Scaffold this motif. Sequence first.
Motif, PDB file in Angstrom:
ATOM      1  N   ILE A 116      53.242  30.023  10.201  1.00 45.22           N
ATOM      2  CA  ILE A 116      53.264  28.843   9.339  1.00 45.22           C
ATOM      3  C   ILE A 116      54.266  29.108   8.226  1.00 45.22           C
ATOM      4  N   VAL A 117      55.055  28.105   7.858  1.00 46.08           N
ATOM      5  CA  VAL A 117      56.061  28.236   6.805  1.00 46.08           C
ATOM      6  C   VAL A 117      55.723  27.136   5.803  1.00 46.08           C
ATOM      7  N   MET A 118      55.302  27.532   4.611  1.00 40.70           N
ATOM      8  CA  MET A 118      54.849  26.622   3.560  1.00 40.70           C
ATOM      9  C   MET A 118      55.908  26.644   2.463  1.00 40.70           C
ATOM     10  N   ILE A 119      56.436  25.473   2.125  1.00 44.48           N
ATOM     11  CA  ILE A 119      57.565  25.394   1.207  1.00 44.48           C
ATOM     12  C   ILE A 119      57.121  24.598  -0.010  1.00 44.48           C
ATOM     13  N   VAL A 150      48.476  40.856   2.072  1.00 47.01           N
ATOM     14  CA  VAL A 150      49.380  39.993   1.336  1.00 47.01           C
ATOM     15  C   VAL A 150      50.614  40.793   0.955  1.00 47.01           C
ATOM     16  N   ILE A 151      51.758  40.438   1.544  1.00 43.97           N
ATOM     17  CA  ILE A 151      53.033  41.092   1.280  1.00 43.97           C
ATOM     18  C   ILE A 151      53.899  40.205   0.383  1.00 43.97           C
ATOM     19  N   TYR A 156      59.146  34.881  -1.196  1.00 49.72           N
ATOM     20  CA  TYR A 156      57.995  34.411  -0.454  1.00 49.72           C
ATOM     21  C   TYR A 156      56.882  35.452  -0.508  1.00 49.72           C
ATOM     22  N   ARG A 157      55.680  34.971  -0.259  1.00 47.49           N
ATOM     23  CA  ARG A 157      54.529  35.806   0.008  1.00 47.49           C
ATOM     24  C   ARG A 157      54.134  35.592   1.451  1.00 47.49           C
ATOM     25  N   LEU A 158      53.985  36.689   2.182  1.00 49.70           N
ATOM     26  CA  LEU A 158      53.600  36.684   3.583  1.00 49.70           C
ATOM     27  C   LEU A 158      52.156  37.148   3.681  1.00 49.70           C
ATOM     28  N   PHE A 177      56.801  30.254   0.797  1.00 49.95           N
ATOM     29  CA  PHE A 177      58.064  30.312   0.068  1.00 49.95           C
ATOM     30  C   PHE A 177      57.888  29.734  -1.318  1.00 49.95           C
ATOM     31  N   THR A 178      58.443  30.425  -2.314  1.00 48.50           N
ATOM     32  CA  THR A 178      58.145  30.151  -3.714  1.00 48.50           C
ATOM     33  C   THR A 178      59.364  29.745  -4.511  1.00 48.50           C
TER      34      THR A 178
END
Length: 282
Positions: A116-119, A150-151, A156-158, A177-178
Amino acid sequence: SMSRVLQAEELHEKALDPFLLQAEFFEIPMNFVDPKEYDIPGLVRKNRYKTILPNPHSRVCLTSPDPDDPLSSYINANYIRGYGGEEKVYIATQGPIVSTVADFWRMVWQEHTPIIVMITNIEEMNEKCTEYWPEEQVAYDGVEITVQKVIHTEDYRLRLISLKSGTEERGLKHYWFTSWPDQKTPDRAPPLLHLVREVEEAAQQEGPHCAPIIVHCSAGIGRTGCFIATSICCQQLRQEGVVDILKTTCQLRQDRGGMIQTCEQYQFVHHVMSLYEKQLSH
Protein backbone atom coordinates in the motif's frame (compact mmCIF):
# COMPACT_ATOMS: atom_id res chain seq x y z
CA SER A 1 -5.36 8.49 -26.30
CA MET A 2 -3.58 11.75 -27.13
CA SER A 3 0.22 11.50 -27.25
CA ARG A 4 3.20 13.84 -26.90
CA VAL A 5 6.48 11.92 -26.89
CA LEU A 6 9.17 13.92 -25.06
CA GLN A 7 12.86 13.37 -25.61
CA ALA A 8 15.28 14.62 -23.01
CA GLU A 9 15.65 18.18 -24.24
CA GLU A 10 11.94 18.67 -24.84
CA LEU A 11 11.06 17.14 -21.46
CA HIS A 12 13.22 19.64 -19.55
CA GLU A 13 11.75 22.66 -21.34
CA LYS A 14 8.22 21.23 -21.23
CA ALA A 15 8.43 20.94 -17.45
CA LEU A 16 9.20 24.66 -17.34
CA ASP A 17 6.44 25.90 -19.68
CA PRO A 18 3.36 26.13 -17.43
CA PHE A 19 1.34 27.80 -20.18
CA LEU A 20 1.79 24.89 -22.56
CA LEU A 21 1.30 22.41 -19.70
CA GLN A 22 -2.08 23.84 -18.72
CA ALA A 23 -3.11 24.14 -22.37
CA GLU A 24 -2.34 20.47 -22.82
CA PHE A 25 -3.62 19.36 -19.44
CA PHE A 26 -7.08 20.91 -19.64
CA GLU A 27 -7.68 19.36 -23.04
CA ILE A 28 -7.52 15.89 -21.46
CA PRO A 29 -11.08 14.70 -20.59
CA MET A 30 -11.59 13.95 -16.89
CA ASN A 31 -13.69 10.88 -17.75
CA PHE A 32 -15.64 11.30 -14.48
CA VAL A 33 -18.57 8.88 -14.06
CA ASP A 34 -22.15 10.11 -14.15
CA PRO A 35 -23.49 9.56 -10.58
CA LYS A 36 -26.73 8.36 -12.18
CA GLU A 37 -24.63 5.31 -13.15
CA TYR A 38 -24.92 4.05 -9.55
CA ASP A 39 -28.57 4.04 -8.44
CA ILE A 40 -27.92 2.50 -5.05
CA PRO A 41 -29.51 3.83 -1.85
CA GLY A 42 -26.86 4.77 0.68
CA LEU A 43 -23.94 4.68 -1.80
CA VAL A 44 -22.98 8.22 -0.80
CA ARG A 45 -22.14 6.95 2.70
CA LYS A 46 -19.36 4.85 1.10
CA ASN A 47 -17.95 7.83 -0.87
CA ARG A 48 -15.71 10.54 0.54
CA TYR A 49 -16.61 12.87 -2.34
CA LYS A 50 -20.09 12.45 -3.79
CA THR A 51 -19.00 13.16 -7.38
CA ILE A 52 -15.71 11.18 -7.46
CA LEU A 53 -17.06 7.73 -8.32
CA PRO A 54 -15.27 4.65 -9.66
CA ASN A 55 -15.73 4.06 -13.37
CA PRO A 56 -17.75 0.83 -13.56
CA HIS A 57 -15.73 -1.09 -16.12
CA SER A 58 -12.60 -1.03 -13.91
CA ARG A 59 -14.07 -0.89 -10.41
CA VAL A 60 -13.03 -3.30 -7.66
CA CYS A 61 -15.99 -5.37 -6.43
CA LEU A 62 -15.88 -6.99 -3.00
CA THR A 63 -17.27 -10.50 -2.64
CA SER A 64 -18.05 -10.12 1.06
CA PRO A 65 -19.69 -10.05 3.56
CA ASP A 66 -22.72 -10.48 1.32
CA PRO A 67 -21.81 -10.60 -2.38
CA ASP A 68 -25.54 -10.34 -3.25
CA ASP A 69 -26.08 -6.82 -1.82
CA PRO A 70 -24.85 -4.11 -4.23
CA LEU A 71 -23.84 -1.82 -1.37
CA SER A 72 -21.94 -4.44 0.64
CA SER A 73 -19.81 -5.18 -2.45
CA TYR A 74 -19.12 -1.53 -3.31
CA ILE A 75 -15.81 0.22 -2.74
CA ASN A 76 -14.55 3.42 -4.30
CA ALA A 77 -11.61 1.77 -6.04
CA ASN A 78 -10.45 1.04 -9.59
CA TYR A 79 -8.01 -1.37 -11.15
CA ILE A 80 -5.30 0.65 -12.86
CA ARG A 81 -3.18 -0.55 -15.79
CA GLY A 82 0.59 -0.28 -15.59
CA TYR A 83 3.27 0.49 -18.16
CA GLY A 84 2.41 -0.98 -21.53
CA GLY A 85 -1.19 -1.65 -20.60
CA GLU A 86 -0.52 -4.45 -18.08
CA GLU A 87 -3.75 -5.17 -16.25
CA LYS A 88 -4.33 -4.58 -12.56
CA VAL A 89 -0.88 -3.31 -11.63
CA TYR A 90 -2.38 -0.87 -9.13
CA ILE A 91 -5.63 -0.13 -7.37
CA ALA A 92 -6.43 3.54 -6.95
CA THR A 93 -8.82 4.18 -4.05
CA GLN A 94 -9.96 6.89 -1.68
CA GLY A 95 -8.54 7.15 1.80
CA PRO A 96 -10.85 4.96 3.90
CA ILE A 97 -13.53 6.70 5.89
CA VAL A 98 -14.94 5.46 9.18
CA SER A 99 -17.57 3.38 7.43
CA THR A 100 -15.21 1.80 4.84
CA VAL A 101 -12.12 0.79 6.83
CA ALA A 102 -13.29 -2.82 7.03
CA ASP A 103 -14.09 -2.70 3.29
CA PHE A 104 -10.58 -1.49 2.57
CA TRP A 105 -8.98 -4.34 4.49
CA ARG A 106 -11.40 -6.70 2.82
CA MET A 107 -10.12 -5.52 -0.55
CA VAL A 108 -6.47 -5.86 0.61
CA TRP A 109 -7.11 -9.48 1.55
CA GLN A 110 -9.26 -10.35 -1.48
CA GLU A 111 -6.74 -8.81 -3.86
CA HIS A 112 -3.63 -10.33 -2.21
CA THR A 113 -2.30 -6.77 -2.18
CA PRO A 114 1.38 -6.82 -1.04
CA ILE A 115 2.05 -3.08 -0.94
CA ILE A 116 0.00 0.00 0.00
CA VAL A 117 1.32 3.48 -0.85
CA MET A 118 -0.29 6.27 1.21
CA ILE A 119 0.45 9.81 0.07
CA THR A 120 -1.26 11.70 2.88
CA ASN A 121 0.75 14.12 4.99
CA ILE A 122 0.98 13.74 8.76
CA GLU A 123 -0.89 17.04 8.93
CA GLU A 124 -3.82 15.68 6.88
CA MET A 125 -4.84 12.79 9.17
CA ASN A 126 -8.15 14.51 9.87
CA GLU A 127 -10.72 14.19 7.04
CA LYS A 128 -8.32 13.02 4.28
CA CYS A 129 -7.33 9.61 5.54
CA THR A 130 -8.85 7.81 8.53
CA GLU A 131 -6.14 5.98 10.44
CA TYR A 132 -6.98 2.47 9.27
CA TRP A 133 -4.03 0.41 10.67
CA PRO A 134 -3.46 -0.50 14.34
CA GLU A 135 -0.76 0.45 16.78
CA GLU A 136 -0.06 -3.26 17.07
CA GLN A 137 -3.10 -5.43 16.30
CA VAL A 138 -6.68 -5.09 15.06
CA ALA A 139 -9.18 -7.23 13.16
CA TYR A 140 -11.74 -6.50 10.46
CA ASP A 141 -14.35 -8.81 8.91
CA GLY A 142 -12.03 -11.77 9.34
CA VAL A 143 -8.57 -10.24 9.00
CA GLU A 144 -6.15 -9.86 11.90
CA ILE A 145 -3.92 -6.90 11.02
CA THR A 146 -0.67 -6.63 12.98
CA VAL A 147 2.00 -3.96 12.68
CA GLN A 148 5.27 -5.86 13.22
CA LYS A 149 7.84 -3.12 12.57
CA VAL A 150 8.10 0.56 11.73
CA ILE A 151 11.01 1.70 9.54
CA HIS A 152 11.50 5.48 9.40
CA THR A 153 13.26 7.14 6.46
CA GLU A 154 13.63 10.76 5.48
CA ASP A 155 10.44 10.89 3.37
CA TYR A 156 8.37 7.82 4.26
CA ARG A 157 7.59 5.44 7.07
CA LEU A 158 7.38 1.78 6.09
CA ARG A 159 5.26 -0.48 8.23
CA LEU A 160 5.91 -4.20 7.92
CA ILE A 161 2.52 -5.79 8.56
CA SER A 162 1.13 -9.30 8.96
CA LEU A 163 -2.43 -10.27 8.05
CA LYS A 164 -3.81 -13.37 9.77
CA SER A 165 -7.15 -14.80 8.68
CA GLY A 166 -8.10 -18.28 9.74
CA THR A 167 -4.83 -20.13 9.21
CA GLU A 168 -3.40 -17.91 6.43
CA GLU A 169 -0.69 -15.38 7.22
CA ARG A 170 0.39 -12.88 4.57
CA GLY A 171 2.85 -10.04 4.57
CA LEU A 172 2.10 -6.45 3.64
CA LYS A 173 4.30 -3.38 3.25
CA HIS A 174 2.64 -0.03 4.03
CA TYR A 175 4.54 2.96 2.64
CA TRP A 176 3.44 6.20 4.31
CA PHE A 177 4.94 9.03 2.29
CA THR A 178 5.31 12.22 4.29
CA SER A 179 6.76 14.75 1.83
CA TRP A 180 3.90 15.64 -0.53
CA PRO A 181 4.52 19.29 -1.44
CA ASP A 182 2.21 22.29 -1.23
CA GLN A 183 4.12 24.10 -3.95
CA LYS A 184 4.96 21.58 -6.68
CA THR A 185 8.33 23.03 -7.50
CA PRO A 186 11.30 21.00 -8.78
CA ASP A 187 13.09 20.93 -5.40
CA ARG A 188 10.23 18.76 -4.14
CA ALA A 189 10.69 16.13 -6.83
CA PRO A 190 13.48 13.88 -5.40
CA PRO A 191 11.45 12.26 -2.56
CA LEU A 192 8.65 11.32 -4.92
CA LEU A 193 11.15 9.82 -7.35
CA HIS A 194 12.75 7.98 -4.43
CA LEU A 195 9.39 6.60 -3.31
CA VAL A 196 8.53 5.43 -6.83
CA ARG A 197 11.88 3.65 -7.15
CA GLU A 198 11.62 2.00 -3.76
CA VAL A 199 8.08 0.77 -4.40
CA GLU A 200 9.09 -0.68 -7.78
CA GLU A 201 11.94 -2.58 -6.14
CA ALA A 202 9.50 -3.81 -3.50
CA ALA A 203 7.05 -4.85 -6.22
CA GLN A 204 9.68 -6.79 -8.18
CA GLN A 205 10.66 -8.60 -4.99
CA GLU A 206 7.18 -10.15 -5.11
CA GLY A 207 8.14 -12.07 -8.26
CA PRO A 208 6.08 -12.77 -11.35
CA HIS A 209 2.52 -11.40 -11.62
CA CYS A 210 2.61 -9.11 -8.63
CA ALA A 211 -0.85 -8.63 -7.15
CA PRO A 212 -2.24 -5.08 -7.26
CA ILE A 213 -0.49 -2.29 -5.38
CA ILE A 214 -2.97 -0.03 -3.54
CA VAL A 215 -2.29 3.68 -3.81
CA HIS A 216 -4.32 6.39 -2.05
CA CYS A 217 -4.54 9.70 -0.26
CA SER A 218 -7.98 11.35 -0.06
CA ALA A 219 -9.99 11.07 -3.30
CA GLY A 220 -7.79 8.42 -4.91
CA ILE A 221 -7.12 10.45 -8.05
CA GLY A 222 -4.75 13.39 -7.74
CA ARG A 223 -1.65 12.47 -5.77
CA THR A 224 -2.50 8.83 -6.55
CA GLY A 225 -2.42 9.65 -10.27
CA CYS A 226 0.88 11.48 -9.93
CA PHE A 227 2.51 8.54 -8.22
CA ILE A 228 1.24 6.00 -10.73
CA ALA A 229 1.97 8.20 -13.73
CA THR A 230 5.49 8.78 -12.48
CA SER A 231 5.93 5.04 -11.92
CA ILE A 232 4.71 4.28 -15.45
CA CYS A 233 6.86 6.97 -17.08
CA CYS A 234 10.00 5.88 -15.18
CA GLN A 235 9.61 2.45 -16.84
CA GLN A 236 8.93 4.17 -20.14
CA LEU A 237 12.02 6.32 -19.84
CA ARG A 238 14.26 3.36 -18.91
CA GLN A 239 12.74 1.18 -21.64
CA GLU A 240 12.17 3.65 -24.49
CA GLY A 241 14.46 6.62 -23.83
CA VAL A 242 11.41 8.95 -23.87
CA VAL A 243 8.39 9.79 -21.72
CA ASP A 244 4.82 10.30 -22.91
CA ILE A 245 3.20 11.88 -19.89
CA LEU A 246 0.14 12.92 -21.90
CA LYS A 247 -0.53 9.42 -23.20
CA THR A 248 0.08 7.93 -19.73
CA THR A 249 -2.37 10.39 -18.18
CA CYS A 250 -4.91 9.44 -20.84
CA GLN A 251 -4.40 5.77 -20.02
CA LEU A 252 -4.93 6.56 -16.35
CA ARG A 253 -8.11 8.57 -16.99
CA GLN A 254 -9.52 5.63 -18.96
CA ASP A 255 -9.04 3.48 -15.88
CA ARG A 256 -10.33 6.04 -13.34
CA GLY A 257 -11.75 9.52 -13.85
CA GLY A 258 -9.78 12.48 -12.59
CA MET A 259 -6.41 10.74 -12.33
CA ILE A 260 -3.95 13.62 -11.90
CA GLN A 261 -6.51 16.19 -10.86
CA THR A 262 -4.71 19.53 -11.05
CA CYS A 263 -2.35 21.24 -13.44
CA GLU A 264 0.16 21.72 -10.63
CA GLN A 265 0.12 17.94 -10.20
CA TYR A 266 0.61 17.48 -13.95
CA GLN A 267 3.60 19.84 -14.02
CA PHE A 268 5.01 18.08 -10.95
CA VAL A 269 5.10 14.76 -12.83
CA HIS A 270 7.03 16.63 -15.48
CA HIS A 271 9.52 17.99 -12.93
CA VAL A 272 10.00 14.48 -11.53
CA MET A 273 10.60 12.92 -14.98
CA SER A 274 12.94 15.78 -15.92
CA LEU A 275 14.92 15.12 -12.72
CA TYR A 276 15.11 11.41 -13.47
CA GLU A 277 16.20 11.90 -17.06
CA LYS A 278 19.04 14.04 -15.71
CA GLN A 279 19.97 11.42 -13.14
CA LEU A 280 20.11 8.76 -15.84
CA SER A 281 22.19 10.86 -18.24
CA HIS A 282 25.06 11.19 -15.73
